[PDB]
Amino acid sequence: KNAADIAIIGGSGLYQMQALTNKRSVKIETPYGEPSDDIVLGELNGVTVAFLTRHGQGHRLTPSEVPYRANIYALKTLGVRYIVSVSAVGSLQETLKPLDMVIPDQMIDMTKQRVSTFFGDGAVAHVSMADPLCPEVADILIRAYDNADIADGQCHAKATYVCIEGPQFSTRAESHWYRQMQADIIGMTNMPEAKLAREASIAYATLALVTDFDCWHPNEQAVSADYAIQNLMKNADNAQQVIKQAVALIASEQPKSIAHTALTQALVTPVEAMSAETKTRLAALLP
Amino acid sequence: KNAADIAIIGGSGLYQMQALTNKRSVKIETPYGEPSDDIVLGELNGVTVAFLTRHGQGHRLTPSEVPYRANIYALKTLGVRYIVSVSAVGSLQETLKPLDMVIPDQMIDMTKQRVSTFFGDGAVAHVSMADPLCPEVADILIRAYDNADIADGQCHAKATYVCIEGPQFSTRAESHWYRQMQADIIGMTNMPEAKLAREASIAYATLALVTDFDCWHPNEQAVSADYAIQNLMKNADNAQQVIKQAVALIASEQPKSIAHTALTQALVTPVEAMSAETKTRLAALLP
Amino acid sequence: KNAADIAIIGGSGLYQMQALTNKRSVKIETPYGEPSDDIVLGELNGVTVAFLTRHGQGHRLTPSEVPYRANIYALKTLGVRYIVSVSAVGSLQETLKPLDMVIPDQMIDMTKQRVSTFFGDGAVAHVSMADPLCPEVADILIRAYDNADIADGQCHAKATYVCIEGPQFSTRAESHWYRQMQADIIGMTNMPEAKLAREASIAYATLALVTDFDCWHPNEQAVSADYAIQNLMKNADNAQQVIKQAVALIASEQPKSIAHTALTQALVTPVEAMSAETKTRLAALLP
Numbered sequence A, B, C: 001k002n003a004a005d006i007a008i009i010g011g012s013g014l015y016q017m018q019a020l021t022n023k024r025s026v027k028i029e030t031p032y033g034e035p036s037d038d039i040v041l042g043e044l045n046g047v048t049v050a051f052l053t054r055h056g057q058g059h060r061l062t063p064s065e066v067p068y069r070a071n072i073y074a075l076k077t078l079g080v081r082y083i084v085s086v087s088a089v090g091s092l093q094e095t096l097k098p099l100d101m102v103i104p105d106q107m108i109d110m111t112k113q114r115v116s117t118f119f120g121d122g123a124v125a126h127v128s129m130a131d132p133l134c135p136e137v138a139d140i141l142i143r144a145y146d147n148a149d150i151a152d153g154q155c156h157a158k159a160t161y162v163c164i165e166g167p168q169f170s171t172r173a174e175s176h177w178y179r180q181m182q183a184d185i186i187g188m189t190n191m192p193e194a195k196l197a198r199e200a201s202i203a204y205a206t207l208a209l210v211t212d213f214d215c216w217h218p219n220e221q222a223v224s225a226d227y228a229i230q231n232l233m234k235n236a237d238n239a240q241q242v243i244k245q246a247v248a249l250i251a252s253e254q255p256k257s258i259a260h261t262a263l264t265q266a267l268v269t270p271v272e273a274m275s276a277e278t279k280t281r282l283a284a285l286l287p
Helices: A068-077 A135-147 A172-180 A190-199 A228-253 A276-281 B068-077 B135-147 B172-180 B190-199 B228-253 B276-281 C068-077 C135-147 C172-180 C190-199 C228-253 C276-281
Strands: A006-010 A020-026 A039-044 A047-053 A082-091 A101-109 A155-163 A185-187 A203-213 B006-010 B020-026 B039-044 B047-053 B082-091 B101-109 B155-163 B185-187 B203-213 C006-010 C020-026 C039-044 C047-053 C082-091 C101-109 C155-163 C185-187 C203-213
Touching: A006 A228, A039 A228, A047 A068, A047 A228, A068 A190, A082 A135, A082 A190, A082 A228, A101 A135, A101 A190, A101 A228, A101 B172, A135 A155, A135 A203, A135 A228, A155 A190, A155 A203, A172 C101, A185 A203, A190 A203, A203 A228, B006 B228, B039 B228, B047 B068, B047 B228, B068 B190, B082 B135, B082 B190, B082 B228, B101 B135, B101 B190, B101 B228, B101 C172, B135 B155, B135 B203, B135 B228, B155 B190, B155 B203, B185 B203, B190 B203, B203 B228, C006 C228, C039 C228, C047 C068, C047 C228, C068 C190, C082 C135, C082 C190, C082 C228, C101 C135, C101 C190, C101 C228, C135 C155, C135 C203, C135 C228, C155 C190, C155 C203, C185 C203, C190 C203, C203 C228
Parallel strands: A006 A047, A006 A082, A082 A203, A101 A155, A155 A185, B006 B047, B006 B082, B082 B203, B101 B155, B155 B185, C006 C047, C006 C082, C082 C203, C101 C155, C155 C185
Antiparallel strands: A020 A039, A039 A047, A082 A185, A101 A203, B020 B039, B039 B047, B082 B185, B101 B203, C020 C039, C039 C047, C082 C185, C101 C203
């Protein structure tokens, strides 16, 4: 079988680097439909990594419609134990600047219309999201960033990510409100991704790429002709360097994650009480 | 007809007590589908009480999928005028400890994906939820708790219950955020139950059983082998004693509730303007 | 073709004034279904205005079920460039009194179950809602209010509108929470209306009519026999005077709105990459 211990979720061409060898595609069907796009597999110095383009090829999906359950289920069928999610974010804080990266340790789920569990319809489980982003993988990302020797910006850790429904950007009042809730960065995609990955017993952490001040800072800038091209471009290229470094550390270090046994004390419906349809739907998630 | 003035909504075997006589089951169909499980009826010292197992037998439903509308409609068809809802909650406050009970007077609805009204599709009404939990029934619960002489814990009143979608437990950031909104306890089930009960003109109040500190307090405890069994067990048994006391007080005192006429000044669409399908669907709710 | 530069969204009989000539109705079909009701067109001193009864005739729709997408799409097909949305609101602030009007400059979207974009299913766009209510149209509304010489109340500007799902009114705890988020007024209808209007490149602003203190102020008053009739009546009649004044100013002044080109730098999927079904669905929104 095609198999990977590690996966990256982000934009396409995160995988488009000569360092990534024997680039190949796999179509995985799941009980939840198809993932956003064929998962790309290849090796980074002999280590197999799965890359999943969250928004599909050509960026064809809005955050609200991303098939999060199919995406996470498909990664679980490849045997993925670690996920690095890479995403563009607005800053809510003066010291978090465009081209900086942020490794949050906390999250607040403000999304509204997304299916955010694998459970229901015949099975009940309540995983803990107290620490929603694996601190072992977040600590690796910090060292990976340093190892990547990135030229512009700095990397910040121990930050709070607020996830909103989208697809519109926030009003100034909502931005002010997120600041008062002590959030630091804002995106649209890492919820319910983090909740599902937890249910799937996969360690999950985020590498956030600051792309502008959310509107708490009136600018209408870093969204220009000579800018958001270079901005997004540079973030994307820098992000690729960090991921290369992170893969090598995850491969050699293999940190134990609390996510790895998240299901075992959370499951309320014993497997022997599930219907056949339920057990089948949940098969890759179960022990 | 089978009839009850009072109903309890909670776990099964709230009704499993020798004091409850001529235990019987009734299957009630509603315009909203079936309730979570057959309603159990019996007498507590001659007084008939309906018990409804919110999560179904064997705890088979997640909070998000509980058929709240069918549950409340079915209780209304039995002529229920008072509901005591019993539910497990996390504490957001140092002085609210595991095995304590809490009688909240306020609620904040943070649920996302639940149908939370009987209205729409041919009828418009806007009930007031200013006081979402009947203070007459909440005052009875306080005296009932004292009357029950419970051995462990204490009971706290005038608290705020935040209801979240689930099924996962909160991140630490969300727990911090609920604390800043001045919530005291967190659960997943009493919304939209309280809104529907109000629309149904039934007095409704909550008895909350503290089962752990929500993650604002890092522990990984009171969820152990020698613990969450005894914890949940003891809460359940203590809860049964309080309910016995509450039923006797509600029966002898019959307090007037503002919930009893909540529909009459809230209804925008006069009954004579409703279609036949609408009037039929809403029949048990109307005057 | 039937055509209007300006539209009013509110209660019926906003248009029921002798000043409004050659009153006529148009049934507009959209890719989203039908609008809440036939749009009424007529002239205010030679200027053609579209009036759309948000809740349908006889107030038959709850806020949650209003067909916001069909409503905004239909107005866009009439060539509307400016929308004044008129809505009843609860006050969260002592200085905002019943019969006052409020022209908010900010909004916080707390609605849960409303489709709040035209995008998805084949097209991706992210408009900025930083300033969600056109300040040119809001400045006109302030001068229009003064010009209308309204007898009771005053008009307040630069306020924050929190939009909730409904249909029930807020608990006291939620009202306290909105106050702490610095919201000033509460309604149920201007989201997703404002987001859709932005996507549609139409300038949009709200005239809010204070109809009572939200429950942060315990009263059970201005909802009485000799009151909420006169209250709502007077608000409605005063609102009509302001709208007359606003139309004349919008017609002579024709302010440029940032909403007018909101789509052009927000669209991620180029038109040439859309399917035929997508381009067709979105036709009136595109360049």
